[PDB]
Symmetry: D2
Subunit: 340 residues, 4 copies
């Protein structure tokens, strides 16, 4: 069989919409017929070769692909044909290293990454490791659930690792694909939410989604503003694609506060070490979520506590989508629609 | 009525040994007759006024004073005349704020600091808040115990907040004034210790103190070496906080690990976003400790698990001591001896 | 010089409504003029002389007293005359034992208890330690806020120590004074709630306050019912005044689950140790809350996440109130109102 | 094709040593050639069919078998021929449930148990699931390491779940088969150890293994004595879970402390509500451990920190061993030796 897929063939170059072979599931693998496929900013970082470790070219991006199991290889019991599943960033892990045994498979040094080290969901079919797919809730449609496979699970786990508790303040910095669902997870977890971004439209979205307080970092120093407005936050989750946002986040917390980092812009951010030590501050990287995190994050969507703000596009318009996302012209998430 | 004390009357200027009034305790205060008084680099910063918030002038430095309660004010129950006590960096906290109520008085924004914001132990007597003094173990001498009020509690608490557990690996980065004490606490906490420094003498010492591995960073890349040999460390305690040490800690730690920063350096440090995020690293600031941390740290000294390298000097030679300290000639810790 | 108070002159015998002297505040004390005063099931036992350790006669009960600071002794800085305050079970603690230093003043062996070991708020005025009073929110009336001083802080802390997290299931066992507010704190903390009691009126209260599911332990086995209904709970909070139910709670949890205990009926409860070990279950007692817990629990009431269901009564009718409470004829809480 | 094994063919009967077919590994399975096989009281419960859910007959007991991988089925990568491995109580878990995904496979309701629900190591060969075997340290002989698969991991994990930390006090209650191993882990974990038993010889042993204090409960009330001496223990590990040991643990633990129950006794135990609640005590069941706990526990044996007292026996004499065990004549652990 042949399928349409969007392929990266050179860093910085436009993706090509090609006819390519349909991947077939070997022993212990499954095939997924894609119905929707979220576009994550990581897909841009990948196509641009922003990161120190680059993807092997050529490859099909996409780690928010969701659909139906369409074929099953031998030795598969976790899922069966017809099951609704998603294939997230964590494509597989080895299952028995120290991290894996501890339930931290997101740290597995042997992991594969969907739409980066193996082909992903910007295509009609993808082959997956059924041990690591998301099992989707019946009550949510493919387009709406697609962003939970990366944006949702990532911010959910990120918020968990801020070590905040109900009634405390959390700042979400960057109200984009990740950030706009972070506001909702944070509210679902009993947190009071402050929003920071550099575009009023994104702050307006945060407001509609439950923020409480919001500030535009292009209009004022957001750290100073938050110290005055809420007395500093207990936690911050940084989903921004700007190193400057990372530095500013450090100044947003109360003493003892924790800044969790999801954003992956290239380079360093300036860190005020003296203050971090004097004020007992924690800065913590957070990387997607484990299968447990993923299933939990999906249940929030199923219960209606989180709903992604989504616009759809066709596979053939991926390059325009990438452009708009680069320019910061996307509200929430774009999700590629493969439905009939 | 009068006592000898070393006084800072001008930032940067030699200290003067002066005759000054003996401070007398009011309601809820106690008076301590100093028998030994530790010296460290913090005293240089106090005396130079080069930190963001300066001491008020004039003042008597010293946050490592140990002695006997020589007088009490009214309404004092925690200690009584003749008790052996130390007057550490945390002189007092407000008792009522969010932090104090949670047992995190080190984060109190209203705290007073001994030998910095109030007079300290470079004098024959000092007035203290009995609610915050350290209660010293009976069987350890004054000169030996003094640095535990500073180096001891700092590295003990720093080790606690690496979130490591018995059997796991910790790197002690820097085997100097703090580092040589940290190796001992780490071993007493059941940790496997890897010592990292550029001085073979210090590394040979770390081995004497129980380090399982010692790497000289002049000769070998400790990040590459530790990743290969032990798979990276679960925790890193950075006791000499330089940009180089900070970067190398990011390299040495295993994914999911925690780096505790135990020192107060000048300037912003460049923090690599990709590494911290993808490796799920925690970076945490930690200096000194709460009253409970301090009492816990004193117990290890009492049981013979931890002994600071100590040398003595007289009060009248404090400037010679400051000079030796500034020139990096001090091995271990110098302690002023007020003994008959 | 004189005031009305309900006094326990002799155990087991109805309380006498007397005119007794007004207590005056000495140094470090404050006087509080009572506006409302909650009735806890605990007060029944104080009055009976029931528990292992008894009050000393004669005494005035009441540790849900709220009002205004009417007089201040010397050396008091936390509060001033006219401040809105409440005087909870934890009247005072020593401030410096291991528990106190660790922010667990509720475990202080030197604690005094309001309306038990020292006089409480079943009277027009009460003298208190300002270091331990609750600081009340302006926007909640006295009658409504009174139960937060014990019912509220207790179940708030109890829920914290079930170690459950948002999205997980908690069972509230016993929907009385404590229980009806526990349902509300649990929802504010992001938990899914199930209710257990022996009366459908009490279950309906719970359903109206946010419980998703409910069951009558007289109609059917609640443990078996819950295992079927929700697949077992991640946590249970037992506020019941029955040793049974304490036994039944253990059967409601998933493997690895935690049962927190607030209720204080006399005697033992039967514990299936084999299952507790096999299933990795935790059983944990929880005693009121620290000052930090109290302030947090008051904040939820301030923000309107929690609102006690309350009936008022006059001091003079205390004994009638005791009867109804004893017979399970109270909905939520009864609060003595001193309103003119 | 054939091998000797000890088989239970009727509950309570002597075991019969039979010639039986050598089990051959299918896909995903490995075969282990047994070199040593630990015996413990759990094997008596398996052979007697004592517990709520019985073994199916007939079966080969033994959940402490260690040896070499002798054959590897298809699709096995974790181990290879010649690897030294143990086959512990947790034979396999489902891999997919809430507990398995969270790294708590010991809570898997679908787990299989070696030498209980599937054949175990009282035979020359056994077939195992490679994903769940213990990977044995190179330094330690088969006979010495065998009990670590059971006593070792159980007491190690039990100590971890007391939530104690270096410098704190733990009581090891019972210094027998489990308890003498627990004293050694506790010391290696930096805990101060108080031993409690009624046997002076076992108490002497505890002292020689590093216990700081030892109390004979025949002669002195260890609850009263420990409260007086050490102010109560932060944790209590109860290795012989009798009603008396359990109630005394409640008396020995300091307020806020944690009691870990390490054994599977018959019947309900009476738990004092008042003491557990007022003292804020945690009681927690814990037996064996996850794959991560097992590997961590094996590391302590590898480093020489823990050594079980072991004597050997031949497979043919397993009934004489069961006899000694039932009569209470076994000191330490007995391990069947299959070596040539
Ligand atoms: N840690 C991981 O597991 C996780 C996983 C998924 C996303 N990624 C990373 O998260 C980042 C965000 O992804 P996304 O899909 O939500 O991108 P996005 O384009 O949808 O959102 C970016 C947001 O950041 C904001 N931004 C830019 N500069 C800012 C500033 N100075 N302050 C505040 N906000 C600012 C933008 O306005 C925008 O709203 C990306 O770098 C992506 O690669 C990492
Ligand atoms: N741990 C603490 O800090 C402390 C704090 C305050 C209250 N206390 C104790 O908490 C308990 C409750 O106090 P309260 O004021 O809410 O009393 P309450 O009379 O208002 O509450 C009683 C509740 O338990 C009842 N009950 C009786 N049998 C039951 C069963 N078999 N299953 C479920 N529920 C059952 C319910 O009817 C229900 O109303 C009392 O024992 C009290 O002394 C604990
Ligand atoms: Zn992504
Ligand atoms: Zn792995
Ligand atoms: Zn110092
Ligand atoms: Zn404070
Ligand atoms: Zn009460
Ligand atoms: Zn106390
Ligand atoms: Zn065993
Ligand atoms: Zn399972």
């Amino acid at each position: 069989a042949m399928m349409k897929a969007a392929v990266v063939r050179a860093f910085g170059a436009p993706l090509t919409i090609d006819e390519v072979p349909v991947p077939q599931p070997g022993p212990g693998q499954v095939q997924v017929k894609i119905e929707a496929s979220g576009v994550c900013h990581t897909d841009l970082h990948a196509a641009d070769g922003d990161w120190p470790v680059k993807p092997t070219l050529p490859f099909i991006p996409g780690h928010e692909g969701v659909g139906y199991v369409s074929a099953v290889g031998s030795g598969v019991s976790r899922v069966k044909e017809g099951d609704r599943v998603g294939v997230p960033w964590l494509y597989s892990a080895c299952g028995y290293c120290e991290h894996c045994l501890q339930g931290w498979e997101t740290l597995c040094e042997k992991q594969q990454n969907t739409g980066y080290s193996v082909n992903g969901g910007y295509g009609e079919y993808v082959v997956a490791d059924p041990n690591y797919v998301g099992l989707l809730p019946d009550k949510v449609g493919f387009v709406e659930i697609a962003p939970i496979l990366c944006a949702g699970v990532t911010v959910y786990k990120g918020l968990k690792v801020t070590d905040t508790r109900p009634g405390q303040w959390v700042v979400i910095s960057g109200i984009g694909g990740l950030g706009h669902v972070a506001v909702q997870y944070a509210r679902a977890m009993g947190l009071r939410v402050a929003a920071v971004d550099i575009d009023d439209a994104k702050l307006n979205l945060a407001r509609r989604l439950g923020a409480e307080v919001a500030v535009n970092a292009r209009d004022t120093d957001p750290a100073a503003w938050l110290q005055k407005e809420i007395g500093g936050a207990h936690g911050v989750l940084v989903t921004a694609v700007s190193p400057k946002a990372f530095s500013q986040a450090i100044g947003m917390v109360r003493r003892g506060g924790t800044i969790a980092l999801n954003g992956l812009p290239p380079g360093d951010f300036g860190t005020p070490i003296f203050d971090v030590v004097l004020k007992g501050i924690t800065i913590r990287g957070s990387i997607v979520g484990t299968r447990s995190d993923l299933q939990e994050s999906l249940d929030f969507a199923a219960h209606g506590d989180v709903k992604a703000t989504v616009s759809t596009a066709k596979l053939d318009d991926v390059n325009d989508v990438f452009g708009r996302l680069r320019e910061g012209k996307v509200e929430g998430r774009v999700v590629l629609d493969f439905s009939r």
